[PDB]
Amino acid sequence: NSNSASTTINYYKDAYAASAGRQDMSQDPKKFTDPV
Amino acid sequence: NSNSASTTINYYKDAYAASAGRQDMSQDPKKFTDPV
Amino acid sequence: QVLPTAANTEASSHRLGTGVVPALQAAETGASSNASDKNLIETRCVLNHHSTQETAIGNFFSRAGLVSIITMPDGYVNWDIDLMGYAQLRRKCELFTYMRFDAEFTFVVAKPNGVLVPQLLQYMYVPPGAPKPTSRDSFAWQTATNPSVFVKMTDPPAQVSVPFMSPASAYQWFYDGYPTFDLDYGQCPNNMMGTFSIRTVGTEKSPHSITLRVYMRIKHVRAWIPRPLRNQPYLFKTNPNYKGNDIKCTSTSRDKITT
Amino acid sequence: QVLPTAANTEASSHRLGTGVVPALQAAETGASSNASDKNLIETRCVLNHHSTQETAIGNFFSRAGLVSIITMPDGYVNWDIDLMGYAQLRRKCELFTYMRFDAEFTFVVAKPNGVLVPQLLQYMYVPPGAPKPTSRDSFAWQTATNPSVFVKMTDPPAQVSVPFMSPASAYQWFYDGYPTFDLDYGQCPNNMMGTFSIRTVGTEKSPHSITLRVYMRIKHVRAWIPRPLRNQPYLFKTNPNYKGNDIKCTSTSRDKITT
Amino acid sequence: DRVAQLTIGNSTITTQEAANIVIAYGEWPEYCPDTDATAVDKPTRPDVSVNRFFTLDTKSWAKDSKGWYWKFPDVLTEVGVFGQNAQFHYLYRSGFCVHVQCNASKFHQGALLVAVLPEYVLGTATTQPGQVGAVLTHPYVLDAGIPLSQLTVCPHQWINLRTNNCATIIVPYMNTVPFDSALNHCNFGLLVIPVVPLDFNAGATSEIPITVTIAPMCAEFAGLRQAV
Amino acid sequence: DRVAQLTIGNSTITTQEAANIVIAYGEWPEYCPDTDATAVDKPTRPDVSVNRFFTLDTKSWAKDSKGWYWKFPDVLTEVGVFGQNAQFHYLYRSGFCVHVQCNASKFHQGALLVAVLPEYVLGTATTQPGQVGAVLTHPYVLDAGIPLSQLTVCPHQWINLRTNNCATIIVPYMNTVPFDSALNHCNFGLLVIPVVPLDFNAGATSEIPITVTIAPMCAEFAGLRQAV
Amino acid sequence: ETILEVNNLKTNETTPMQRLCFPVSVQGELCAAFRADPGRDGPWQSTILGQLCRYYTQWSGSLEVTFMFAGSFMATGKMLIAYTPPVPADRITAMLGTHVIWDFQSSVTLVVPWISNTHYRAHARAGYFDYYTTGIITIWYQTNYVVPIGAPTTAYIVALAAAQDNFTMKLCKDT
Amino acid sequence: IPTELKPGTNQFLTTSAPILPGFHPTPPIHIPGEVHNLLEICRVETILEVNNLKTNETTPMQRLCFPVSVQGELCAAFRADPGRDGPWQSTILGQLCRYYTQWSGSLEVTFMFAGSFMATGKMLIAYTPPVPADRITAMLGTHVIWDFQSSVTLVVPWISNTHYRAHARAGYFDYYTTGIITIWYQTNYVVPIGAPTTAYIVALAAAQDNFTMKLCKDT
Numbered sequence A, B: 001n002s003n004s005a006s007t008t009i010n011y012y013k014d015a016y017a018a019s020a021g022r023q024d025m026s027q028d029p030k031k032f033t034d035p036v
Numbered sequence C, D: 001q002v003l004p005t006a007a008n009t010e011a012s013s014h015r016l017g018t019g020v021v022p023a024l025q026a027a028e029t030g031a032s033s034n035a036s037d038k039n040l041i042e043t044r045c046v047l048n049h050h051s052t053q054e055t056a057i058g059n060f061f062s063r064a065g066l067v068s069i070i071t072m073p074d075g076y077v078n079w080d081i082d083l084m085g086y087a088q089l090r091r092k093c094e095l096f097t098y099m100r101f102d103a104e105f106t107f108v109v110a111k112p113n114g115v116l117v118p119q120l121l122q123y124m125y126v127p128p129g130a131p132k133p134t135s136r137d138s139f140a141w142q143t144a145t146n147p148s149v150f151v152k153m154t155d156p157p158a159q160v161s162v163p164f165m166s167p168a169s170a171y172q173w174f175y176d177g178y179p180t181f182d183l184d185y186g187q188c189p190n191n192m193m194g195t196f197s198i199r200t201v202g203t204e205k206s207p208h209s210i211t212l213r214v215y216m217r218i219k220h221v222r223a224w225i226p227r228p229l230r231n232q233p234y235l236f237k238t239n240p241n242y243k244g245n246d247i248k249c250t251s252t253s254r255d256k257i258t259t
Numbered sequence E, F: 001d002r003v004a005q006l007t008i009g010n011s012t013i014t015t016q017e018a019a020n021i022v023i024a025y026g027e028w029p030e031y032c033p034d035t036d037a038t039a040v041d042k043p044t045r046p047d048v049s050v051n052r053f054f055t056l057d058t059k060s061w062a063k064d065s066k067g068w069y070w071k072f073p074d075v076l077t078e079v080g081v082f083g084q085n086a087q088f089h090y091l092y093r094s095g096f097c098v099h100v101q102c103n104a105s106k107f108h109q110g111a112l113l114v115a116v117l118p119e120y121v122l123g124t125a126t127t128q129p130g131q132v133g134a135v136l137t138h139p140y141v142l143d144a145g146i147p148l149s150q151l152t153v154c155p156h157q158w159i160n161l162r163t164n165n166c167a168t169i170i171v172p173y174m175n176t177v178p179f180d181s182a183l184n185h186c187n188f189g190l191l192v193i194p195v196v197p198l199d200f201n202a203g204a205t206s207e208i209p210i211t212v213t214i215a216p217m218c219a220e221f222a223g224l225r226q227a228v
Numbered sequence G: 001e002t003i004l005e006v007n008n009l010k011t012n013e014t015t016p017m018q019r020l021c022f023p024v025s026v027q028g029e030l031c032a033a034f035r036a037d038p039g040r041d042g043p044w045q046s047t048i049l050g051q052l053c054r055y056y057t058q059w060s061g062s063l064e065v066t067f068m069f070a071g072s073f074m075a076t077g078k079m080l081i082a083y084t085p086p087v088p089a090d091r092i093t094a095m096l097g098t099h100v101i102w103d104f105q106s107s108v109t110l111v112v113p114w115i116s117n118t119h120y121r122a123h124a125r126a127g128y129f130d131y132y133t134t135g136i137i138t139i140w141y142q143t144n145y146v147v148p149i150g151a152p153t154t155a156y157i158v159a160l161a162a163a164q165d166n167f168t169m170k171l172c173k174d175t
Numbered sequence H: 001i002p003t004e005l006k007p008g009t010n011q012f013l014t015t016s017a018p019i020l021p022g023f024h025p026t027p028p029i030h031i032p033g034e035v036h037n038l039l040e041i042c043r044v045e046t047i048l049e050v051n052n053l054k055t056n057e058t059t060p061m062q063r064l065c066f067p068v069s070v071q072g073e074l075c076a077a078f079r080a081d082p083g084r085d086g087p088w089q090s091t092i093l094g095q096l097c098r099y100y101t102q103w104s105g106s107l108e109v110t111f112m113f114a115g116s117f118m119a120t121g122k123m124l125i126a127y128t129p130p131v132p133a134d135r136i137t138a139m140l141g142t143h144v145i146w147d148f149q150s151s152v153t154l155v156v157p158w159i160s161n162t163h164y165r166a167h168a169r170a171g172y173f174d175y176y177t178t179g180i181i182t183i184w185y186q187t188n189y190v191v192p193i194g195a196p197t198t199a200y201i202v203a204l205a206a207a208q209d210n211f212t213m214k215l216c217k218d219t
Helices: A029-033 B029-033 C057-061 C087-093 D057-061 D087-093 E047-051 E080-086 E148-153 F047-051 F080-086 F148-153 G016-020 G048-053 G128-132 H060-064 H092-097 H172-176
Strands: C016-018 C065-072 C076-080 C098-110 C120-126 C148-152 C158-162 C195-200 C210-224 D065-072 D076-080 D098-110 D120-126 D148-152 D158-162 D195-200 D210-224 E004-006 E013-015 E054-060 E068-072 E091-093 E096-101 E109-118 E156-160 E166-171 E188-199 E209-216 E220-222 F004-006 F011-015 F054-060 F068-072 F091-093 F096-101 F109-118 F156-160 F166-171 F188-199 F209-216 F220-222 G021-024 G030-035 G056-060 G063-069 G078-084 G098-103 G109-112 G136-141 G155-163 G168-172 H065-068 H074-079 H100-104 H107-113 H122-128 H142-147 H153-156 H180-185 H199-207 H212-216
Touching (some): C057 C210, C065 C076, C065 C087, D057 D210, D065 D076, D065 D087, D148 D158, E047 E209, E068 E209, E080 F080, E109 E148, E109 H199, E148 E188, E148 H092, E156 E166, F047 F080, F109 F148, F109 F166, F148 F188, F156 F166, G021 G030, H065 H074, H092 H100, H092 H199
Parallel strands (some): F011 G098
Antiparallel strands (some): C016 F004, C065 C210, C098 C210, D065 D210, D076 D195, D098 D158, D120 D148, D120 D195, E004 E013, E054 E209, E068 E188, E096 E166, E096 E209, E109 E156, F054 F209, F096 F166, F096 F209, F109 F188, G063 G155, G078 G136, H100 H212, H107 H199, H122 H142, H122 H180
């Protein structure tokens, strides 16, 4: 079953019992610095 | 993720936690003995 | 957009002209200046491979921290579940306002002097509204529905995973308002996630004091609307009240501004 | 080039002529002679299969060694991280100048007499600039961000892996210069990798003395610009200073040169 | 192969009897590549001005001398356009070509070991002798606890009065950081130790000079300080 | 067109209210061509190091000042890497970009004539004032017997407090010889003479500064002397 | 971009509201000077960039400093902002290093280039870590602060600090 | 999932979970002079301390060479095993060999004359497999005639009853010896008038291409 807060290793039936892998590398420059 | 100092067994997400395998067999004779 | 590495630096040269000016900006607009280093000084072409994985929120938050300490000098204590009891983690999670994540807990149990003695313990998580045990032999210990953990003291520390159990979309560390139509102010109902209780299994009186340490690990975190950090020591575990006399300066002072 | 095995020996015969001479060389040029055994004596064809894997730097360095000993006769000690405290490893790693590698650490803890007693310990790695704990119950023990290790004494020795954490490209065992614009000389800032602290978890006073032994293993090593070894006993843990009176000869002397 | 000439910059060195040229570790000096540079400011390359061969002082070899050593680039820190430039900057990267000349008659005898030891550290002011250069006290251990018998593992050239009179070494820039200062660090040092003492019959040219000539190869600089 | 920015070298100058850029005689500064070079030695081009904008001292404008002048390149002879370089060479060729800044409030009044006179010769020590710069004595004849009323024939830019506060001049290297020394000749001089005296009602910012900023453009050098 | 606490004077402890800016008056001398390392205690401590950098050990990248004039409209003048790699004594000796000429829209954006002998720099302090310093920032009067009659003779300038695009951090630590 | 414990668990051997989950190491840069095999250092020529006399302890500078004068007798002799204590201890080859137990391969010994230019003569260098008494009885073994460019390169061939030889000592390990190296005057050291009558000869030792080592040990 799929149930998680959000390439990971899981050993159980639930999806919220797993170890996070390589975190996503993505940012939005303009959104915070220049929101005009 | 790839992160190491430099055919190896790894059990974790990080790449610097692994056991070195068969080391490379390569030497440069002339470089040290005869650098003229 | 994906930015695996920081942007490289391009080559440049001198510039002399009219109309174009990157140096001048407008801070009144509230937007940070977009001037690049290549627009003011001559820079060589430098290619960088500095990864930004270490600055991700997941790696920044994925570190277990002490959340509370429990001492058992009647043989049981019912401790309310709260995560704002220690500054070392409170300052970390209080930088954001709303976060949705997944919590992992680890329990370390030892005697006050650190010695280990064979003894069997039981932990129960009591959801809000569930009956609360009142004795070491209370009928609430039958754990018909509530999850339970049993472990000896000499055994390795227990590790469990707790899902995101809030009725709302995400936890909120601040509630500007009242939950009911003065001490009540600031209490968000969406944060009270029940309580915690521990006991010794035997119906007799345990002959050793028990101290438990709880560490919380986080995973699959997602933050929203960052807020400025806190520069004042805490005074209470519920509200950001501070000592109104000794206002600590953010920056250490010096002697003269010219030196 | 790849040389899995040492070069074989080719067959040869007698040689008599003028002009060609492999025996004569020129040591003034600073280059080792390239004369092969086939150029001076008649040699049979010998094929050898002696592998050179045992002479690789990885296999030569992949051996755990004692780096320091720590005794706890206040209940905590903050020990600075350094690897030049014992000759058996200092001579080994001091043959090269710059090396980039990956360190693996193992901790062995026992009583002074070697007896094992159930007791819970905590280890923290303090990066440079991080707050340093000053008491067994100091607030710095909350380990909000610093990595921590918890293990009982009776448990098997702990094993952790530490990545290459130097700001420069590789560690340097020598710094001919000053880090600031006399005891200061020889101190490279790129080697101070923070400190190490241990303690007993319980807030009480532990009733047993604690001795810890730390062994460091290496992997993924890469060396540069080898330097001559050291033939004099060490006198300090920072500089190669030596006793200026008893200059130990490199080679053991004999009676007469003709015998 | 006995004769050679090097004409780097506005200078020129010739020798009618010399050995071969020894390149340290087989790496020709070269400018810093973009993939390795970390500085964000455009560097300066004086080129011809800083590559003029510079001749230091002259050391007098005696029948019982111990040895002499120099620290680089502290020797060149106080001389020429290189001195006036390095004192005005903060980042430095260059190679070096070292030339040592010492000629004697056909009847003298003695040997010298010209060897460049990268990143020389002394032990028990004198750390940076300057253009003058200091002398050694315990040449057997090099005042560092290492045996001189294994000093040949470093790039070196032998100066034997029987055959040759001069030797050359071309060492590239070796340091763990692409750029480095010039007043707080020393890239390497040079060692000159007489393994075979000079001996001669009475009635010869007793005064025997020793001269060291050096010249930067691929000098580059960055940062503009005021005066240091 | 009222705003402009010049970012030559590791420096940058910006102005929110300035006039246009005046190029002297319509010739952009450039390196010496092979067809015109007469030197046989390879020249040096420090490039970025010598093109950093240099700011000289500040002159205080008064209600009865006569005028001030500077001699080039004697101003830069004693400052920065340019000073330490020109003192080590014998041949010199570069252009110049001159910037003069003087800002006043909206209620002050007065005019200035910033004009560069090529090859200024004085008449009846003070010939080479240096970085400080000397003052004039008879501004009507410029101490040279020529009328100031015809000084506009030379490249110039007007600084009128009503409209602008700064002016720029880009003058190339003008001399009858492709190369020339730096300690025995002056390529040109700069003139600043208040044609309209400064006037203001009592109760204003009496202190009014005058600043001159200059920077070489295409510097090159040849010859290696010892110290001059 | 966040506010920088330049005026961290001893007498300003009781009245922190005046610690967020420094005054400019009618005089060429200097007005303010401070170190540019975001990790060391001082003016950078009040910035969120420095506060975050306290949680890490190694950082690299160029920095940007932006100023904003707050004086009267009729006020005018020119100020010089200079950054000195590894303290100046006067204008002519401070002009050698990287500098920006500023004239009174009024928002100058000084950029601090990344020059260091090492790829990753650590937070500076007293001792061996002094070798990891970054430099000194100073500002000087290019021309006097000219104001007409019937106007205030004193003006205040605020300082805003931020990080450039090529910033990075590693080796997370707990403060 | 079923599992069975096996002997040897919880046994720490000197021959791993990470602590930092997002560290990216500083990028490497090109550094000249990288060593990939420890055998490369062994293939370099280093000085040999032949004159290890008792009186030379206070003045080690004279322990790096031996004198040659005008006399056919011998001048110097020493064992050729790089492991045993003695002249080979000062060589980096011997120092490295102290870290290993078994080695095999041929060795090369190079000499260098340091006398005056007008000096001349012929010297005989001989290597004796398992000590000679004179020239005619020492000439039977492998030898090289040397005449005074002046750099003779004596090669020590690898002859042994076993594929891998161990470091020699007193006792059973005497069986692992390798031989004796000696040098003799082929002709007298002739020098003209007005020239020094004594000359010094330095000894340089190195390892050949077919060298190898195994069984790493700690000294």
